[PDB]
Design a binder for this molecule. Sequence first.
Ligand SMILES: [Fe+2]
Ligand SMILES: [Fe+2]
Lengths: 533, 533
Amino acid sequence: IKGMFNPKIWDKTFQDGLKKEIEDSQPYNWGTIHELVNDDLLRAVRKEIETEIHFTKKETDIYRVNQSPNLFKLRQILYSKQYRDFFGYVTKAGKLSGSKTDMSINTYTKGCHLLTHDDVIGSRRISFILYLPDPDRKWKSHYGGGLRLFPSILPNVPHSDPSAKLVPQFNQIAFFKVLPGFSFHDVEEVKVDKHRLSIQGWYHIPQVGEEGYIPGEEEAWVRNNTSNVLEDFEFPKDERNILSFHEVKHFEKMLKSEAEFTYLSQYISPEHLSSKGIEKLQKQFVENSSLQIESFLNDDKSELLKKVIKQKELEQECPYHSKDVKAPWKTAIPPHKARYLYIDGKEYRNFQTEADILEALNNNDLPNFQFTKDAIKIISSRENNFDAELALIDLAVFHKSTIFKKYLALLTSLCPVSEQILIRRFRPGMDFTLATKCRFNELLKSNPDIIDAVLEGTLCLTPSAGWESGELGGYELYMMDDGDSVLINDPPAWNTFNLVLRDESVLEFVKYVSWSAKSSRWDVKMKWDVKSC
Amino acid sequence: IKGMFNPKIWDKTFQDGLKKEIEDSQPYNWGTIHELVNDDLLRAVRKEIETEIHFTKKETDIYRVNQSPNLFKLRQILYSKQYRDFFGYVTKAGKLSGSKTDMSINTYTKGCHLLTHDDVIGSRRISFILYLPDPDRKWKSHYGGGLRLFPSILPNVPHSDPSAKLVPQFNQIAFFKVLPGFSFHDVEEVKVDKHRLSIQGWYHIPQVGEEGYIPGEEEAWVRNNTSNVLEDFEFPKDERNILSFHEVKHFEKMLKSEAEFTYLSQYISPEHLSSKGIEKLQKQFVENSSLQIESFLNDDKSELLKKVIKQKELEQECPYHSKDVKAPWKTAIPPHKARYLYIDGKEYRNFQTEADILEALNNNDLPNFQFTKDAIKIISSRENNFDAELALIDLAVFHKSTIFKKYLALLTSLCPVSEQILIRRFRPGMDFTLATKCRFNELLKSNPDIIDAVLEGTLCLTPSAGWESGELGGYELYMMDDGDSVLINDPPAWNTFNLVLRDESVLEFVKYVSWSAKSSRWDVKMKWDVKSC
Ligand SMILES: [Fe+2]
Ligand SMILES: [Fe+2]
C-alpha cells in the first residue's frame, strides 16, 4: 500500500536489470534510478522545504554547503520494508535497518562544493541521495554540481581524477553500497547561480531486535575502522631534508656580510634588508611567533614574476587531468588528502598506476632545483611554459642558499637544521589541501636541541584580484583544535611572505580554489626544522 | 775558518740577490742554492753513508721512503754561526738555534714518495734539504722525485695542483721559512729505478741562553698550533643524507619479494641472492662485523663495466690537473687530506678560486644520480667518456634503491637510516686518501636507536693486474689506533664488495696509487648510518 513510487521499481524485470547494472558499474559499485518517486510527492516535499526550511551556508576545508508535513511521508516510504528489501537486493547489501534512519536536506548554490571522500562514517551501510533540482527545467551539465566517482589505484588510494560523473535531474536518485577504501566520490562545485536542493541519506546495519540483525556485527565494523601505512602514498611527502654540517654550524656561530647583504638584496626588497626593517621583523616574531611581510620580493623580481605568471595564465593552457601534468610539474595525491600542482627538486613522476607509485618509492631521489633548472633550460612557442618555471626555480634556489637561511635565522634567532621547499599552483577548478598538523622528524624528536615545532613559510605570488573574502577560496588558514580559533586566514595576495612557527596544536590548509577564481593561486612554500639559538 | 762552502755564498752581492729571490718566490717564500758545499766534502759524506748506513723501507698513508765521520763535519758547518747567520738573513727568519740540531738521511727509490704537507711540526723554524743524487750523472726531470710547492687558495687550503717543482741535482739545497698554512710541498714519486740520497733538516727557535732567544716564544708557537672550521673546505663532505620515513619504516617492519629478488638479480650475482648465499653472508657478518664478497656483481654487469672501463683507460685521456676535470667528475680537496676524482649526485664544481668554493657552500645541492644520469645522456667520439659514467651511474642508482637497502638490511640485520654514495677514480699519478675516522652525524648522536658506527661499503671495479702486494698502492686499509693493527688490507680487485661496520677506533684510507699502476683504481663507496633491528 506504499507502492506510490515509480510503478516500475516494483516490476521484477526492472529490479533484475538493476542489480546487474550496479554489478557492472565502475569504478566501484553504484547505481541510479531516473524517477524514483511519485512526481507529485516530490513537488510537494520540495515545495514544502522551499517554504518552511532555513538553509545556512557552512564552510570547512572539505566543503561549502548550505545546511539544516508530507516530507515525513517521503521518509517513511524510503525506510519502509517494501523499499529497504528492494534496495538491499539490487544493491547486494542484505538487511538494512528501517528503525535507525538519517537524512539531510542541503542546497548547493554557486561556489558550494563537496570534495572527495568515501562517505564511510560509523554504521552507514548504503549511501543514497535523491535530488531536488527545478522540476520544470532541465539541469545542464555545465551548471556543475555533478556527483563524481573516483577509481581507486590502491585500496585507500583514489586516483586524483574522477572517472564517472552524472548530472542529476529532479526525480533522480544515486546510491552505492559503502565499500571502505573504494567508494570515493565528491560533488563538482556549482558553477552557476542556482539552488540545487538535495536529500542525502543512509541506511544502516540492522539494529537490536530488528529483521536481519547480527550481534556485535555493527561494532565489528566501526571498531574495525582504526593503518597509517598509507602515509607512503602521499606525494609530495611531508618530510624535511637535513642541512649540511656547515650551514647549521655557521648559523649557531652568528647567534653564538657586505657581500651577503648584496646577495640578499637581489631577491628581497631593500625595506627588509635595512637595519630597521630587520629590527621590526625581529620585534614582531618575538611576540607573535610569526610575521607577515608585505611586498617582500624586490621590485625587479616582483615585476618579472608577475610578468611571466600573468603571461602563463593567459597565453597558456593549464593541464586539468593528472595525466596531462608535464615536467617540471607534479600533482599532489591522493585526492582525499589534497590535490594541486607543484614542482619540488625531484625527478619527474606521473602516478597513473600502482607501478608508477612503487617505482618512485624504490627509486627515491633527493630534491635539486639546480639540476631541474638546468634541464628545463636545455629544453628550448610553448616555452612560456618554462618562462614562469625558470623564474620560480631561480626563486627556489635563492631560498635554499645558505645565505638566505642565515638571513632567516637572524629574523627568528632560530637555527634552520633542515629544509623542504615546494613551489605550488592551485587551479581554480581543482586544487586545495585539508587541515593537517605538521610531521616532526622521527629521528630528531629524540633530541633536546630541536624544539617540537616547524618553521613554516609561504611566499604568495598570486597576481589576480577578488580573493576577498574569501568566497573565492585559495586562502591560507592556520588554527588550533579541540567555537573557532583560526590564527591566520590570509587570502591569496601578490608578493607576500608569511612566517609561522607551528607546534602540534596548529592545523593548516589552503582552501579549495573556487572555479570562479580569476587565476590559480601560486606560491612558494618552505618548511624548516629548528634549533634554539 | 769554516768557509769551505761555495765561496760565493759568502759574497754579499750574491747573498743580497738571494734574499730578493726568496722574497719574489712563489707560491710561498722558498729558495735554492745550486752548489752549497765544497764538492769534495759531499762526495765524501755521500760515499760514507753509501758504505756505512742502512736504509730500510717504511710505508704509511702519507709516504713510502727508506729511512735511518766527516758527515759529522757537514753537520757542524751547517749549524755553524757563520752559516746560520747567513741563512736566517737571506731567508728573513732571524735567529736560529745551532744548539738544537736535527737532520735525517733518506733514500727515495722507485715507488718511494712523500705527498703533500707543510713541514710544520713543533719548534722547526726553517726547513731545508740538501740533495745527494749521483754526482757523476745528471738527474733528469722525468726520473721523478722532484720537490713540489703548493699555492694556497685559502690559509690552510692548498690548491690540489702544485705550481712549482725543481729537479734537484747533486750539490743542490732547497729550503724555506716554515710558514704555517702555506708552506705545502710534497715529493713527486720516483718513477725510475735509482736511489736518490738526501739529507733533510730543520733549524729551530733559538733555545735558552742562546743567541737570539726570547722566553716563552717557542711555546707561544707550538701551543698556538691547536680551528676545525677548515672542515667546511673538504670536498666531498663526510656527511650522510637521511632516508625517507618510508624506507626506514619498511626496513624495521621486515626485521620486526618475488619481485624484489628479480630486481636485485639484475645487478647482483645469483650466488648472493640465493638462500644459502644470503645465509652464509649473514653468518659471516654476525661474527666479523664485515663481509668480503667475491665476484659480487652478476656477469652481465661485471662484463659491461669491465668493457667500458678498460675501454676508458685505453681509448681515453685522463685529466691530470684539477682544472681539467670535466663533468660529471669532481676532484677531492684539499691535497693534504686527499686527492682523487669522483662523481657524487651533486651539481658540477671546479674549485680553482676562493669564490668557486664559497659559491658551492652557499648553493649547497643534494645528490641526485638520476638527474645526473639524464644530463650526461642528453649530451651526445669522446663519448666513451660517458659510456663508463652512464654504466657506473646506473650502478649508483641501484645502491640507492629502497629494495637494495632492504637486501642490505637483511644481510646485516641493521637498518639503514641515511646514505652517502660516491663513485671514485684514483689515478696512478696522483690519487690517495689518508687515515681518518668516520664522522658520525651530530644531530643523530643525540639518540639511542642509532648506534655509534657507520656501515661502510666498497665495491671495487679495478680491472688491471699487479695490485699485489701492495707496492703498487691503491689498496684499501682499515685499522685501529693508539706495533700494527691493520684489520683489512685489500689490494684493488675486480668486482669485489667489502662491508665493514666501523666504530670510532677504526681508521681507513686507500693508499696513494703508484705511478706505475697499470690503471686507475675504480670503485663505488657507500656509507650508511644504522639503527638496531
Ligand atoms: Fe557523500
Ligand atoms: Fe718536507
